[PDB]
């Protein structure tokens, strides 16, 4: 239970790596020295390399360098996916193909000033003569989130009664707005027993009058779900960006309540 990642899409022979500090609990203390609004920045680039004798090892090396290292968790919230296709029958076993899919935000002023000198330096960088590495400015996110009520009689398998499910839409101006304001909320109020946190954070996040409708429903339940889809819209008309990169809200009751109910 708590903030679970969704598995990731795993290729037949494709290398894929996984860099996230997004399961850490937003700190509203670090966040409060940010006083200006930053788009949250995109990596969704993709390149043949066939024919060009690059190891899987190589191609890591290069994203490395001029990517994922610069982007530091002490400064960037940022949630990474790098894959490269190698292809099995070739007597190196050279890659074929990569992919960066990436989302980040810089967490601080400071961290604002490290982020427009790195987009100077290697915004359009020349990834293998293939493609560059262009990291775009999302306009803002939406985020549909659904919630799930229900009883579930094992608590280490997938399976339980759905009793209600509800969804809300929000529009943020970047995801950092998301977890200062919506995941910090979840932290504070969703995994509360005390009515007078649960039922008002369901007013504010689900309906105005969920609250009095959920009383009697968290009463008869064991366990929640959050699963807040974050929808990038990017600045081209009908351009949307959703990572492949997904994580939810488990809420074992069961457990972490003395009546073994959610409320």
């Not at 043949?48 to 190891?55: D, K, Q």
């Not at 339940?221 to 990038?232: A, C, D, G, H, T």
Request: with cysteine; aromatic share 14%; net charge negative.
């Amino acid at each position: 239970d708590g903030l679970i990642f969704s598995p990731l899409p795993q290729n037949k022979n494709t290398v894929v790596r996984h860099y996230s500090n997004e399961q850490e609990m937003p700190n509203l203390s670090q966040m409060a020295q940010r006083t200006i609004d930053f788009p949250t920045q995109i990596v969704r680039v993709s390149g043949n390399l066939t024919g060009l004798e690059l190891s899987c090892d190589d191609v890591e090396n290069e994203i490395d360098q001029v990517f994922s290292k610069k982007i530091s968790p002490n400064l960037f919230t940022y949630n990474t996916y790098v894959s490269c296709g190698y292809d099995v029958n070739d007597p190196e076993q050279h890659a074929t193909n990569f992919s960066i899919q990436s989302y980040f935000d810089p967490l601080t002023d400071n961290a604002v000033d490290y982020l427009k000198s790195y987009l100077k330096e290697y915004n359009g960088y020349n990834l293998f003569n293939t493609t560059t590495l262009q990291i775009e400015n999302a306009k803002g996110i939406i985020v549909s989130m659904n919630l799930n009520a229900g009883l579930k009689s094992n608590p280490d398998k997938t399976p339980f009664t759905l009793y209600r499910q509800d969804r809300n839409n929000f529009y943020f101006k970047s995801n950092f707005d998301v977890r200062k304001e919506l995941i910090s909320d979840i932290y504070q109020r969703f995994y509360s027993n005390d009515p007078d946190m649960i039922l008002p954070f369901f007013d504010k996040w689900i309906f105005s009058y969920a609250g009095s409708v959920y009383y009697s429903i968290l009463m008869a339940s064991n366990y929640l779900e959050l699963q807040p889809e974050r929808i990038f819209v990017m600045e081209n008309e009908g351009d949307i960006f959703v990572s492949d990169l997904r994580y939810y809200f488990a809420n074992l009751c069961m457990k972490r309540n003395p009546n073994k109910h959610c409320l």
